[PDB]
Amino acid sequence: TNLCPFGEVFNATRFASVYAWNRKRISNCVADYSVLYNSASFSTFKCYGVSPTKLNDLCFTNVYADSFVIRGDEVRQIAPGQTGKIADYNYKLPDDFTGCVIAWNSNNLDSKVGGNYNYLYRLFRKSNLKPFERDISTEIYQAGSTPCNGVEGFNCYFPLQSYGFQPTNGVGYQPYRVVVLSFELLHAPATVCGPK
């Protein structure tokens, strides 16, 4: 039928912060993954539960496309079972994830000479996120045994920080755009097929 709007996800001018990650639902469409690999600006293109070279053979009930910016050296946290402040406090995949993780260096768009101000990550949380949970709160975080009463001060931390990407950062610190495609299989007819 008609073709899945991957362009709107991958070529969006602006991306979300990882703590406030974006989700777009993809349904009732043909998903030609040749587009994606053919546009070889990708430095991460990996899948779980499916083979990356065989995507064009497959059908799913729904596909979800989550997207955000992190540092290059945090892309490794975007995977089932990983630990670290990104996997635990910002964006968590389930252990049984079926889908693909794609990432590419976005230094030319997302870094700014004054320091990018909008890309944030959560660095403190009372407990880990559940898979696909999204937390946008900005409550002062009680790191000690003294209650904070909503006021920032010693051991009473603001819970987000900015990456501050600048064009001159080394490559592990440069911004990467990330798209996580979830391949959902429910007891239902399948609405996202490739050119099998």
Partner: nanobody, 128 residues
């Protein structure tokens, strides 16, 4: 005694340059937004420049925008204030103190309401 000991400073002519720094004593800096403040002769301490915990966001008052650059090195627990194109009106004692983040992880100029541990500060004099 939690404190941020200021260093650097001194006497320069108009158009001169200074770099102040302030090092955390009794705590570590990493998660805290820090401001630089200055107390000109007979005046209140005014915020001049602030930087968020990560270093990613900075803010400057009008009279120093374009001339001062704040930065930090969390591994050394130090914050810096590079001051260029100095003017007589920049003459003041300069101090560091923790400030609050804004809810978008930026920084505001006011020291924590609690905070009483100003240092000695460091003297800056700009004169002909």
């Amino acid at each position: 005694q939690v404190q941020l000991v200021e260093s650097g400073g001194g006497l320069v002519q108009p158009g001169g340059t200074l770099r102040l720094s302030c090092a955390a004593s009794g705590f570590t800096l990493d998660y805290y937004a820090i401001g630089w403040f200055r107390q000109a002769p007979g005046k209140e301490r005014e915020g001049v420049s602030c930087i968020s915990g990560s270093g990613g966001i900075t803010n400057y008052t009008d009279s120093v925008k374009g001339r001062f650059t704040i930065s930090r090195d969390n591994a050394k627990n130090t914050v810096y204030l590079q001051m260029n194109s100095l003017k007589p009106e920049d003459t003041a004692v300069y101090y560091c103190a923790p400030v609050s983040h804004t809810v978008v992880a930026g920084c505001a100029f006011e020291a924590w309401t609690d905070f009483g541990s100003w240092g000695q500060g460091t003297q800056v004099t700009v004169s002909s």
